[PDB]
């Protein structure tokens, strides 16, 4: 349990204020974990960001043409870049216990 001025989580979860547009979603404006390349609009969007748009109208949010989950492909060229930054960004100054 708690002891004094403690807590599990006080709202919010993350805070990416140092990511380039290449990683940030064009619509969600947030970090992209699974960026999919749209073969229609040629735009990079999260695999989940597109799914929400392919719920009632299976098409592109920009091109507005025939599009589906099978059409969109995973942006490996970008995903590989996110792994390099997400791993490099975690540098910090250096803990100190002693």
Swiss-Prot record:
Q: Where is the U-box domain?
A: 18-92
Where does it reside?
Cytoplasm
For domains, the record's comment is:
The U-box domain is required for the ubiquitin protein ligase activity.
Purpose: Ubiquitin-protein ligase that probably functions as an E3 ligase in conjunction with specific E1 and E2 ligases. May also function as an E4 ligase mediating the assembly of polyubiquitin chains on substrates ubiquitinated by another E3 ubiquitin ligase. Mediates 'Lys-48'-linked polyubiquitination of substrates.
What disease is associated with this protein? Answer: Neurodevelopmental disorder with hypotonia and gross motor and speech delay: An autosomal recessive disorder characterized by severe global developmental delay apparent from infancy, axial hypotonia, limited or absent ability to walk, impaired intellectual development, and poor or absent speech. Additional features may include seizures, behavioral problems, distal skeletal anomalies, and facial dysmorphism.
Which family does the record claim for this protein?
Belongs to the ubiquitin conjugation factor E4 family.
What protein name does the entry list? Answer: Ubiquitin conjugation factor E4 A
Q: Which gene encodes it?
A: UBE4A
């Amino acid at each position: 349990g708690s002891s004094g001025s403690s807590g599990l989580q006080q709202q919010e979860e993350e805070t990416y204020a140092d990511a380039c547009d290449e990683f940030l979603d064009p619509i969600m404006s947030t970090l992209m974990c699974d960026p999919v390349v749209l073969p229609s609009s040629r735009v990079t969007v999260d695999r989940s960001t597109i799914a929400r748009h392919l719920l009632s109208d299976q098409t592109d949010p920009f091109n507005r043409s025939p599009l589906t989950m099978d059409q969109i492909r995973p942006n490996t060229e970008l995903k590989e870049k996110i792994q390099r930054w997400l791993a490099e960004r975690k540098q910090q100054s250096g803990p100190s216990s002693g």
